Amino acid sequence: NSNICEVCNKWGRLFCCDTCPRSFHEHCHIPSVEANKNPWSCIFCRIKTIQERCPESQSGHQESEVLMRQMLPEEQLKCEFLLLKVYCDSKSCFFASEPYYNREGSQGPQKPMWLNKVKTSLNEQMYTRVEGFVQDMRLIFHNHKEFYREDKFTRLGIQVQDIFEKNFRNIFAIQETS
């Protein structure tokens, strides 16, 4: 197994996947690494299994259809993984914890949002459809863009949104288009 966390790339108290060589800090994995379970398989393995059990699940889909799906176990898992993939980028640090807004010439967003809050929302099963998760995720970046205006810091929002969007298309097998 790896000697660094797959998500944050740091050493520490790691839990090792029994079916691939990845390792995690307890709360870097999503969901948090489970108390018992020997063997244990990580979220990357669990996602791979879904794909292998139903190969047709990789045929192209329409986003509009994906968003209306109910958060049954498999969609719940996919959203957890997508969230994990965002945390895997180090630029996610800017969006992890609760922000605040005091900048000359700008007003804070009406509805602040941050990755840890989405993380709690997933854990507490507060989303009934994929749409709920995806709306909150996209809200994070949109609030950032709007607040930082012409400051070049706006680009961090663009960059992390691009990570989100690419992984969304991959994980939910969105039909490729130009």
Q: Closest approach of Cβ 53 to Zn ion, in Å?
A: 7
- What is the C-alpha to C-alpha distance for residues 24 and 10, in angstroms, rounded to an integer? 9
Nearer to Zn ion, 2 or 135 (CB): 2
Count other Cβ atoms within 10 Å, centred on residue 90: 11
158 is a contact residue toward Zn ion (CB under 5 A): no
Nearer to Zn ion, 58 or 123 (CB): 58
Q: Among 118, 125, 75, 123, which residue's Cα sits nearest to residue 97?
A: 118
Q: Closest approach of Cβ 44 to Zn ion, in Å?
A: 5
Q: What track of x and - describes contact with Zn ion for positions 15 through 44 (by CB under 5 A)?
A: --x--x-x--x--x-------------x-x
- What is the C-alpha to C-alpha distance for residues 122 and 128, in angstroms, rounded to an integer? 10
Q: Closest approach of Cβ 23 to Zn ion, in Å?
A: 9
The residue behind tokens 């969007």 is: 165
State whether the Cα torsion 68-74-79-82 is positive or negative.
negative
93 is a contact residue toward Zn ion (CB under 5 A): no
119 is a contact residue toward Zn ion (CB under 5 A): no
With contacts defined by CB under 5 A, how many residues of the chain interact with Zn ion? 12
88 is a contact residue toward Zn ion (CB under 5 A): no
State whether the Cα torsion 14-124-133-70 is positive or negative.
positive
Rounded to 10°, the helix 115-123/73-87 angle is 160
Q: Which stretch binds Zn ion (CB under 5 A): 6-14, 69-77, 96-104, 140-148?
A: 6-14
What separation in angstroms does the CA of 157 have from each of 47, 111, 142, 152, 153? 27, 16, 8, 10, 8
84 is a contact residue toward Zn ion (CB under 5 A): no
Q: Closest approach of Cβ 109 to Zn ion, in Å?
A: 29
Given the rule CB under 5 A, which residues bind Zn ion? 5, 7-8, 17, 20, 22, 25, 28, 42, 44-45, 54
